[PDB]
Amino acid sequence: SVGIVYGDQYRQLCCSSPKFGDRYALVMDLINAYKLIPELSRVPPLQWDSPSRMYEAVTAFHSTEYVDALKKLQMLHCEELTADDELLMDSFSLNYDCPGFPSVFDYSLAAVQGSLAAASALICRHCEVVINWGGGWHHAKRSEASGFCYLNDIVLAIHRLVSSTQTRVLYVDLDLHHGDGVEEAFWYSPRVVTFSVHHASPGFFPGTGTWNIFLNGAGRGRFSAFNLPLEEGINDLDWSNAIGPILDSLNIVIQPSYVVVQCGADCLATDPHRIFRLTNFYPSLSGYLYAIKKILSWKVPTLILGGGGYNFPDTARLWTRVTALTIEEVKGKKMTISPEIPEHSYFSRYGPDFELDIDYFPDSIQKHHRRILEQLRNYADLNKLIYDYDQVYQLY
Numbered sequence: 001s002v003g004i005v006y007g008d009q010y011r012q013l014c015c016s017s018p019k020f021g022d023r024y025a026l027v028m029d030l031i032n033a034y035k036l037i038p039e040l041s042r043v044p045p046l047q048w049d050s051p052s053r054m055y056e057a058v059t060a061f062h063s064t065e066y067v068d069a070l071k072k073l074q075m076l077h078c079e080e081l082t083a084d085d086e087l088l089m090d091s092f093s094l095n096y097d098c099p100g101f102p103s104v105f106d107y108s109l110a111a112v113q114g115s116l117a118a119a120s121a122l123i124c125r126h127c128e129v130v131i132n133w134g135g136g137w138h139h140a141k142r143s144e145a146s147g148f149c150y151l152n153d154i155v156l157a158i159h160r161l162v163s164s165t166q167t168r169v170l171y172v173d174l175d176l177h178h179g180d181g182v183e184e185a186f187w188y189s190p191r192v193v194t195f196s197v198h199h200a201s202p203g204f205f206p207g208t209g210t211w212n213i214f215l216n217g218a219g220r221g222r223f224s225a226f227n228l229p230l231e232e233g234i235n236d237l238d239w240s241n242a243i244g245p246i247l248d249s250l251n252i253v254i255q256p257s258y259v260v261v262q263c264g265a266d267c268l269a270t271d272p273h274r275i276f277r278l279t280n281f282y283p284s285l286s287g288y289l290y291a292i293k294k295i296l297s298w299k300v301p302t303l304i305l306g307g308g309g310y311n312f313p314d315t316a317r318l319w320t321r322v323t324a325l326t327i328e329e330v331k332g333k334k335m336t337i338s339p340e341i342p343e344h345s346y347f348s349r350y351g352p353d354f355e356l357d358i359d360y361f362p363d364s365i366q367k368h369h370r371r372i373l374e375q376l377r378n379y380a381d382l383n384k385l386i387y388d389y390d391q392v393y394q395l396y
């Protein structure tokens, strides 16, 4: 039973931003064109009994003043801003990368509604895995919008998971960018282990998840925040070998109750960032599909979320394959996807070849592996977890 977050209103809201435009619609219509929808349990986004209940849910992480500012920003964009209102927005970074637009609050709230409903479906055991392609806004902070992330749906979903009972959550962030917002939220918590693989280089957004020595959490959360910064140009195989032993070692040591995976598609070779060279190939084998298949082999209730990805048809091509892989891994039912894009309302967006495969022809890691292994040992010692060092050592 694989769950997928969707709904008519949800679709309209996810498609209402100037940055992500109709991406979510392309993603969901491609999944539907590949006849995957009948295999999936629709997870309806969470709706609240009152404005107070909605505030209680969002303020489990964000400050009231920030939520008030975001709701006022939407109101203001539904009618220019005064000098005092511009100052107020600037105090929450609601500007530049995170501008206001008529549906800014509804749009960012929708991802939270989706990811909280997805966590609830895992908690009641209705779904083994839940997918939310409208979610994964990893950069949003308590009182600050960042990288087009206004509300952090991941933190709120993880917070719902961790507090459902000892519950431990493993958060794996596959996006090109460092998952700073999620890592910061759980910096002092040993029960949420964060691991982000990403590109890092001077002046590259958001700037964290790299050498500062490496910070890895604080207080009781020391050694609980893991990071693997990778150089530009990394391909499927090298990225797969870089993350594989880390994922496996985290699962053996942490023994998570839940896994939350952020699957931002900006690592694709065809993403306009043009930083990593990952594919959606399923014979080289896509780094994403290798990582997703590995996580699902653990048989731990999992939450799969979206994130980055500016090349909309290529993000759809990758997420359609992630979706089919999840059905296969959970149900044990073969999913056969035709290499040609099937006819549907968005067919023309996949041109000029109309194929499912993206249009692409293809010591530092060992040093990070040793650093990460030491951190995992340190985390295990601080948290009094029983583990076999040799079983973990041999994975690398």
Ligand SMILES: O=C(NO)c1sc2ccccc2c1Cl
Binding pocket: 128, 129, 296, 297, 298, 299, 300, 301, 302, 329, 330
């Ligand atoms: O509840 C389960 N088995 O009894 C399963 S099967 C499976 C496959 C992938 C991820 C989670 C999961 C769970 Cl939980």
Ligand SMILES: O=C(NO)c1sc2ccccc2c1Cl
Binding pocket: 097, 138, 139, 146, 147, 148, 175, 176, 177, 205, 264, 266, 307, 308, 309
């Ligand atoms: O895909 C993204 N993060 O995972 C990012 S980073 C960033 C920085 C400025 C503006 C947007 C943006 C997005 Cl989207």
Ligand SMILES: [K+]
Binding pocket: 173, 174, 175, 176, 177, 178, 179, 196, 197, 198
């Ligand atoms: K990442």
Ligand SMILES: [K+]
Binding pocket: 186, 187, 188, 189, 190, 191, 192, 193, 194, 217, 221, 224, 225
């Ligand atoms: K942590």
Ligand SMILES: [Zn+2]
Binding pocket: 175, 176, 177, 264, 266, 307, 308, 309
């Ligand atoms: Zn990104």
